[PDB]
Structure formats: C-alpha cells, structure tokens
Design an enzyme around this catalytic site. Structure first.
Site, PDB file in Angstrom:
ATOM      1  N   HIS A  41     -28.955  -1.241  14.726  1.00 24.29           N
ATOM      2  CA  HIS A  41     -28.150  -0.550  13.705  1.00 24.29           C
ATOM      3  C   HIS A  41     -27.031   0.326  14.302  1.00 24.29           C
ATOM      4  O   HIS A  41     -26.219   0.910  13.565  1.00 24.29           O
ATOM      5  CB  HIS A  41     -29.025   0.237  12.717  1.00 24.29           C
ATOM      6  CG  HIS A  41     -29.778   1.376  13.333  1.00 24.29           C
ATOM      7  ND1 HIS A  41     -31.133   1.321  13.557  1.00 24.29           N
ATOM      8  CD2 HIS A  41     -29.386   2.614  13.722  1.00 24.29           C
ATOM      9  CE1 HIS A  41     -31.546   2.462  14.074  1.00 24.29           C
ATOM     10  NE2 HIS A  41     -30.503   3.263  14.196  1.00 24.29           N
ATOM     11  N   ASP A  96     -35.335  -3.946  15.543  1.00 25.01           N
ATOM     12  CA  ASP A  96     -34.078  -3.199  15.504  1.00 25.01           C
ATOM     13  C   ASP A  96     -33.662  -2.813  16.927  1.00 25.01           C
ATOM     14  O   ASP A  96     -33.710  -1.640  17.327  1.00 25.01           O
ATOM     15  CB  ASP A  96     -34.246  -1.975  14.600  1.00 25.01           C
ATOM     16  CG  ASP A  96     -32.915  -1.337  14.190  1.00 25.01           C
ATOM     17  OD1 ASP A  96     -31.853  -1.614  14.792  1.00 25.01           O
ATOM     18  OD2 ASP A  96     -32.819  -0.514  13.242  1.00 25.01           O
ATOM     19  N   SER A 189     -31.412   7.488  17.966  1.00 29.84           N
ATOM     20  CA  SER A 189     -31.681   6.057  18.135  1.00 29.84           C
ATOM     21  C   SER A 189     -31.290   5.618  19.548  1.00 29.84           C
ATOM     22  O   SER A 189     -30.212   5.992  20.065  1.00 29.84           O
ATOM     23  CB  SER A 189     -30.901   5.249  17.115  1.00 29.84           C
ATOM     24  OG  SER A 189     -31.513   5.433  15.833  1.00 29.84           O
TER      25      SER A 189
END
Length: 237
Positions: A41, A96, A189
């Site tokens: 993402h 992800d 992240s």
C-alpha cells in the site's frame, strides 16, 4: 508509533524512509544492498528512498539518497486495494508486501546495514522491537522527527484476533504491549519487527486511524514469504 521512545541513533540501520515528492510516506527494511522491503500500500509513481536517517526534521551526514528502478508486489496482493487512499481496519495484511529494487546499491556503513531474513520460526513469549516515524497526523504529515521504538511481546495470534478474526492467517503475527498505551500508525508501515534478535515481521497498517497493538494484526509474518522474497531478489538483481 504512539507511546514509544526515541531509538538510539543508528540502532536500526536497516530502517528505510520512503518519500514521495518531499513528503514522508512510509518506512521499510533494507534486506540487500539493492533491495527494500515495504508494504504494497506504500506503492507510488516516484520513490525517494532515504537510508541512514534518524531525525527526518534535519539534514544528516549519514543520510543516503536512492531512487528505485523496479517494484515487485506479492502476486497475491489484491490489486483493487491500490485504488483506496486508505485501507480499512478489516483488510487482510497477509500479502501487503512489496520489494523495491534500488537503482544503485546501498553503501554499507555504521548507519546503513541490511537486516538478515529469519532462519527459524519465532517463539511465543519472545521480546520484540519495532521502529518507525509514523505520526498520528495521518492526513497531513505521515512521519517526521526522530525514529521511535517500542518493546512488545510475541503472543499467540488469537490474542490479536477478537476485533477482526478474519485477519488471523498464517501470514500474520501478534505482538502486544503493556497496556492500551501503544499504537502503530500508517507511516510506520514497512518497519521491521525483530523478535529475540531475529527479523520476524514487518509493519503493514494502511488505515488512517492508528492501531492499538493489542487489538489488531499489524505485522505481516516474514517466514511464509521467504521463498518469494529470496527468489525475487535472486532473479532480478
């Protein structure tokens, strides 16, 4: 990270800062001189990669600037998620994951080092650390200032499964914190989760609200992705 502490400078020398057009986007892990592992993402059309950082709010002599030549997403990542500015708290973090190939290899220094992939399964009850610059201000500035750290304990996955049980898979880890005092934010992240001194997880949180460690799966488990990570590096370096 909310509720953490400032890491010792250069104590996480694999830590990456991924920017877009001067704006901080996410972290990442240097896994080979030519490769950064981060969340899918965090895909963008123009990466600015910074290694060797501590305080993003000032110029640093150890900072090393890199561009990216290619991106490789986990083939099982649902590409329709890329259309969303923010993922949802129920979205599966299992796949992800993205590898970014650096246009030029990193120079290895005291401040810039790779993080080795795990060579054994993580043990429940181990102590873990993760790091990042993610801020609560996810709509306006995703990361700034000094690199933050937090201590966690690796727990059985069910401890993190109560709010979104569908997120409990073989591709996630559960690492808890002493009270409701700690959360991970979007800009974290790509940060490594290191448990008993071994790289075992990587942060993948794509929602605009920060996540309490105790109530959410926020770490993608590295072990089940070893074949793909290693084969992608081998084939494309």
């Amino acid at each position: 990270i909310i509720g953490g502490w400032e890491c010792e400078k250069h104590s996480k020398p694999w830590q990456v800062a991924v920017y877009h057009q001067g704006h901080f986007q996410c972290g990442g892990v240097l896994v080979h001189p030519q490769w950064v592992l981060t969340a899918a993402h965090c895909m963008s059309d123009d990466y600015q990669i910074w290694l060797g950082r501590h305080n993003l709010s000032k110029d640093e002599d150890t900072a090393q600037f890199h561009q990216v030549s290619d991106s490789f997403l986990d083939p099982q990542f649902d590409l329709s998620l890329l259309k969303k500015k923010y993922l949802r708290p129920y979205d599966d973090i299992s796949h992800d994951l993205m590898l970014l190939r650096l246009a030029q290899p990193a120079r290895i220094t005291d401040a810039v080092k790779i993080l080795d992939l795990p060579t054994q399964e993580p043990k429940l009850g181990s102590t873990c650390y993760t790091s990042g610059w993610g801020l609560i201000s996810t709509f306006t500035n995703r990361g700034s200032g000094t690199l933050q750290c937090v201590e966690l304990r690796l727990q059985s996955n069910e401890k993190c499964a109560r709010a979104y049980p569908e997120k409990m898979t073989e591709f996630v880890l559960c690492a808890t914190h002493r009270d409701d005092s700690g959360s991970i934010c979007l800009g974290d992240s790509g940060g490594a989760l290191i448990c008993d001194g071994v790289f075992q997880g990587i942060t993948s949180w794509g929602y605009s609200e920060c996540a309490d460690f105790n109530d959410n799966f926020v770490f993608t488990k590295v072990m089940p992705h070893k074949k793909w990570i290693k084969e992608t590096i081998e084939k494309n370096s």
